[PDB]
mmCIF file of C-alpha atoms in Angstrom:
data_model
loop_
_atom_site.group_PDB
_atom_site.id
_atom_site.type_symbol
_atom_site.label_atom_id
_atom_site.label_comp_id
_atom_site.label_asym_id
_atom_site.label_seq_id
_atom_site.Cartn_x
_atom_site.Cartn_y
_atom_site.Cartn_z
ATOM 1 C CA UNK I 1 -20.770 -65.914 -23.995
ATOM 2 C CA UNK I 2 -19.563 -69.442 -23.126
ATOM 3 C CA UNK I 3 -16.520 -71.286 -24.502
ATOM 4 C CA UNK I 4 -17.465 -74.703 -25.968
ATOM 5 C CA UNK I 5 -16.486 -77.087 -28.664
ATOM 6 C CA UNK I 6 -18.155 -79.824 -30.711
ATOM 7 C CA UNK I 7 -14.643 -81.379 -30.868
ATOM 8 C CA UNK I 8 -11.600 -80.064 -28.897
ATOM 9 C CA UNK I 9 -7.991 -80.990 -29.215
ATOM 10 C CA UNK I 10 -9.231 -84.005 -31.165
ATOM 11 C CA UNK I 11 -9.337 -82.102 -34.431
ATOM 12 C CA UNK I 12 -7.608 -79.090 -32.972
ATOM 13 C CA UNK I 13 -3.888 -78.680 -32.598
ATOM 14 C CA UNK I 14 -2.157 -75.260 -32.814
ATOM 15 C CA UNK I 15 -1.943 -76.095 -36.492
ATOM 16 C CA UNK I 16 -5.715 -76.600 -36.942
ATOM 17 C CA UNK I 17 -6.525 -74.093 -34.208
ATOM 18 C CA UNK I 18 -4.370 -71.359 -35.780
ATOM 19 C CA UNK I 19 -5.020 -72.313 -39.400
ATOM 20 C CA UNK I 20 -8.632 -73.509 -39.500
ATOM 21 C CA UNK I 21 -10.431 -70.327 -38.469
ATOM 22 C CA UNK I 22 -13.686 -72.319 -38.149
ATOM 23 C CA UNK I 23 -11.884 -74.730 -35.867
ATOM 24 C CA UNK I 24 -10.923 -71.903 -33.515
ATOM 25 C CA UNK I 25 -14.019 -69.685 -34.132
ATOM 26 C CA UNK I 26 -16.560 -72.547 -33.906
ATOM 27 C CA UNK I 27 -15.311 -76.141 -33.433
ATOM 28 C CA UNK I 28 -13.069 -75.436 -30.453
ATOM 29 C CA UNK I 29 -14.617 -72.263 -29.001
ATOM 30 C CA UNK I 30 -13.759 -74.044 -25.705
ATOM 31 C CA UNK I 31 -10.082 -73.008 -25.781
ATOM 32 C CA UNK I 32 -8.266 -73.654 -29.027
ATOM 33 C CA UNK I 33 -10.885 -71.499 -30.324
ATOM 34 C CA UNK I 34 -11.752 -68.992 -27.697
ATOM 35 C CA UNK I 35 -10.411 -69.494 -24.110
#
């Protein structure tokens, strides 16, 4: 697969990336999410 995000760091910080599963599993699949 490919790692992408509809929003990155913008609405993703270790707090949102570790706590908002959708943020890591879908919003930030670019890194915060999956890379």
